[PDB]
């Protein structure tokens, strides 16, 4: 397991595409700060530090839209799209002036700065840049 951050984004994405109420990821302080933002932006209902077989996990409670009417009842997602940006094979860093705007504004870019994990909107306010972790909408 070479990229826990991309493994968590993928655990969520695989979980949301089958409409799970939750899914557990192996826990870490950097992961919680990333989920901390998904809640504070409504992409998730939130998480809780659970344990499985004696090992510290993060149970992430997923969130979807209203049921739909037609041949496809399955409801619209709330996290339509979440993908890794900076990777172990290619670190990606932006200064404050080059922070991108995910989806014209309707989306969030998650950064790690020396003022902590922040959205692109948060980061522009505090005027810092950092490692472009991922993007969500």
């Amino acid at each position: 397991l070479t990229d826990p951050i991309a493994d968590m984004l993928t655990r969520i994405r695989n979980a949301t595409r089958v409409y799970k109420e939750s899914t557990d990821v192996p826990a870490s302080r950097f992961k919680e700060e990333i989920l901390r933002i998904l809640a504070r932006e409504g992409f998730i209902k939130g998480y809780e530090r659970v344990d499985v077989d004696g090992k510290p996990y993060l149970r992430v409670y997923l969130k979807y839209g209203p049921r739909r009417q037609g041949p496809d009842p399955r409801p619209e997602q709330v996290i339509h799209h979440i993908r890794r940006i900076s990777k172990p094979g290619r670190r990606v860093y932006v200064g404050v002036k080059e922070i991108p705007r995910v989806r014209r504004g309707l989306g969030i870019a998650i950064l790690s700065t020396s003022k902590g994990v922040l959205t692109d909107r948060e980061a522009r306010k505090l005027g810092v840049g950092g490692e472009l972790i991922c993007e969500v909408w």
């Binding site: 037609g70 041949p71 009842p73 399955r74």
Partner: protein
């Protein structure tokens, strides 16, 4: 009307030919057979019926769909009771999506009423009185419940959504709600108002269709009680 003595009537069946989406309506497996959470049946049934009465009280029609030989005769019993359409024989592809055209077929049945009524030329060669009476009886076999339907229904009541997946496919294609009685071999997400329960024992089908009709007739003014039920 939501009786709790349905436990004496079905509590579900069907071993492991299940559909994993139906796991949310299961309690355990007794003989290695899947058995249904009757409370989950209760809760849904209440929400299900809350839809049904609302539709009767506004003069909305409900097309009853059952073809499996178990529910086949009793969907005729209870839907003739409620004076509402049924389909008990072969379901005909396009009975919703191609309604105007299958409805061109009941018009023909209608004219064979006003023809074989009498006496409009029985001076047609005996091949014809033999032939049309065959067509008539044939049309009668399949359209006896559908002719009552003169326009796209506002809901359909299916007794097996797996068996009647075609009808579910048409009604969903037309944004028509689908109430149904499903057991473990069916896909819940495809039905709008669920009745999670055995759909093979006439026991279960009678206790659900009749009590469904009891809500229909009562919400149309003037109630009535016991209706047919073979032992």
């Amino acid at each position: 009307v939501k009786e709790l003595l349905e436990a004496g009537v079905h509590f579900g069946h069907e071993r492991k030919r299940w559909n994993p989406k139906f796991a949310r309506y299961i309690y355990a497996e007794r003989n290695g057979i899947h058995i249904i959470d009757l409370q989950k049946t209760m809760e849904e049934l209440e929400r299900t019926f809350r839809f049904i009465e609302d539709l009767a009280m506004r003069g909305g029609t409900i097309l009853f769909v059952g073809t499996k030989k178990q529910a086949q005769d009793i969907v005729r019993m209870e839907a003739e009771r409620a004076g509402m359409p049924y389909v008990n024989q072969r379901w005909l592809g396009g009975m919703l999506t191609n309604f105007k055209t299958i409805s061109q077929r009941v018009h023909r049945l209608e004219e064979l009423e006003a023809l074989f009524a009498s006496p409009e030329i029985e001076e047609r060669p005996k091949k014809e009185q033999v032939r049309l009476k065959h067509e008539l009886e044939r049309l009668q076999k399949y359209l006896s419940g559908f002719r009552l339907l003169k326009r796209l229904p506002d809901a359909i009541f299916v007794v097996d959504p797996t068996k009647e997946a075609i009808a579910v496919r048409e009604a969903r294609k037309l944004f028509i709600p689908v109430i149904a009685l499903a057991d473990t071999d069916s896909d819940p997400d495809l039905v709008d108002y669920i009745i999670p329960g055995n759909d093979d024992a006439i026991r279960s089908i009678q206790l659900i269709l009749s009590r469904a009709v009891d809500l229909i007739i009562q919400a149309r003014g003037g109630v009535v009680e016991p209706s047919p039920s073979y032992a």
